[PDB]
Amino acid sequence: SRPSSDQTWQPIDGRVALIAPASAIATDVLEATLRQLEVHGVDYHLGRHVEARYRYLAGTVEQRLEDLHNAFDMPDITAVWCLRGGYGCGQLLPGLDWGRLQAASPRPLIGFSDISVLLSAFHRHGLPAIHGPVATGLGLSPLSAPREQQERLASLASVSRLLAGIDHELPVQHLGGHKQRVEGALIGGNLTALACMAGTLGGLHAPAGSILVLEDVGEPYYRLERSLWQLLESIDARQLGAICLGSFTDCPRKEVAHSLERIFGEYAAAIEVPLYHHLPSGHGAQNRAWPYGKTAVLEGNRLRWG
């Protein structure tokens, strides 16, 4: 839409498994998160190791795998909502039992940031997923600007709304390349996270025709370029349908002579892949959920899925 300001949650049937596959979580934020799930009538299961700490990680690989596997063992679970991104979920890939995950009834995996790595791996294995807010967004101290807090809340609500199938599109703007309709699977997420898996068993799943969404946070422009060069070189980039930029938050220009649009535009043109931007997805208050690995269409000023 604009995106829409609407922030009423839809009911979530069943039970949401909460896991922490990446960075460690604060107890106060966790408790506030759980209280908000109860406010919304959302039944949950809290992973046994979500309060573990191992340097900045939410416990060891083994602890995190125990919780991730358990989320697929339990019969009543209808979604797996990651509590926090940051760093570390790619570490789980060597030990992940894909057969155990595939045997379970459908339960979309939800998150963004570092979680983009698991979203991609899930897509590779035909498992449903959502790129959207992490669950601890519910427990954060409110943003000081009321309008930004409202946008955080609309972004959090978009998870249940997408699970329910009631939201179907997000706004975009064409930036470069051809203007024809593009239809393909939605992939991507955090540029840094995905570049940091290239050359590994967790490299981005990028089938032909896909719409590659990219967002990032906290990066100088040269580092964004370095990540983009790596990621595009590492996949069959010329076979992509489109690149669609979300937000680039806390990435100040610092006197770099070329804009971010110029840099991304140059890379997209060199592979003859059209470029879109202004998708309301990323690390700002605007972080609307989108269905990961699902077919969508870029046409005029919208990204629309069925």
Residue 116 in contact with K ion, rule: CB under 5 A: no
Q: Give the residue closest to K ion by C-beta.
A: 192
Say if residues 109 and 82 touch (Cβ distance below 8 Å): yes
**What is the sign, positive or negative, of the torsion defined by CA atoms of 23, 26, 27, 30?**
negative
Cis peptide before 252 (omega within 30 of 0): no
Q: What are phi and psi of 49, to 5 degrees?
A: -110, 15
What is the chain's Cα-based Rg?
Answer: 18
**What is the sign, positive or negative, of the torsion defined by CA atoms of 164, 165, 171, 176?**
positive
Name the catalytic one among 49, 123, 131, 283: 283
Site map for K ion, 209-228, x if CB under 5 A?
A: -------x-xx---------
Residue 113 in contact with K ion, rule: CB under 5 A: no
Residues with Cβ < 8 Å from 98, sequence gap 6 or more?
A: 125
Residue found by looking up tokens 């879109």 in the block:
276
Alpha carbons 1 and 172: distance in angstroms, whole number: 9
Question: For the chain, what is the largest distance between any 2 Cα atoms, rounded to a whole number of angstroms?
Answer: 55
Q: How far is the CB of 110 from K ion (least distance, A)?
A: 20
Residue found by looking up tokens 């919780």 in the block:
67
DSSP 205: -
Query: Which of 151, 216 has the CB closer to K ion?
Result: 216
Query: Which of 95, 218 has the CB closer to K ion?
Result: 218
Q: How far is the CB of 226 from K ion (least distance, A)?
A: 11
Query: Which of 169, 219 has the CB closer to K ion?
Result: 219
Stretch that binds K ion, among 1-9, 108-116, 149-157, 192-200 (CB under 5 A): 192-200
Annotated active-site residue 283? The verdict is yes
Name the catalytic one among 169, 215, 219, 225: 215
Site map for K ion, 39-78, x if CB under 5 A?
A: ----------------------------------------
Name the catalytic one among 23, 113, 155, 281: 113
Annotated active-site residue 178? The verdict is no
Alpha carbons 42 and 303: distance in angstroms, whole number: 29
Size of the site for K ion (CB under 5 A): 4
Query: Which of 154, 195 has the CB closer to K ion?
Result: 195
Say if residues 253 and 219 touch (Cβ distance below 8 Å): no
Query: Which of 67, 216 has the CB closer to K ion?
Result: 216
Residue 192 in contact with K ion, rule: CB under 5 A: yes
- Of the chain, the end-to-end C-alpha distance in Å amounts to 15
17: left (phi over 0), alpha (psi -120 to 50) or beta: beta
Q: How far is the CB of 90 from K ion (least distance, A)?
A: 14
Stretch that binds K ion, among 14-22, 34-42, 191-199, 244-252 (CB under 5 A): 191-199
Q: How far is the CB of 223 from K ion (least distance, A)?
A: 8
Residues designated as active site: 113, 215, 283
Q: By the criterion CB under 5 A, which residues form the site for K ion? A: 192, 216, 218-219
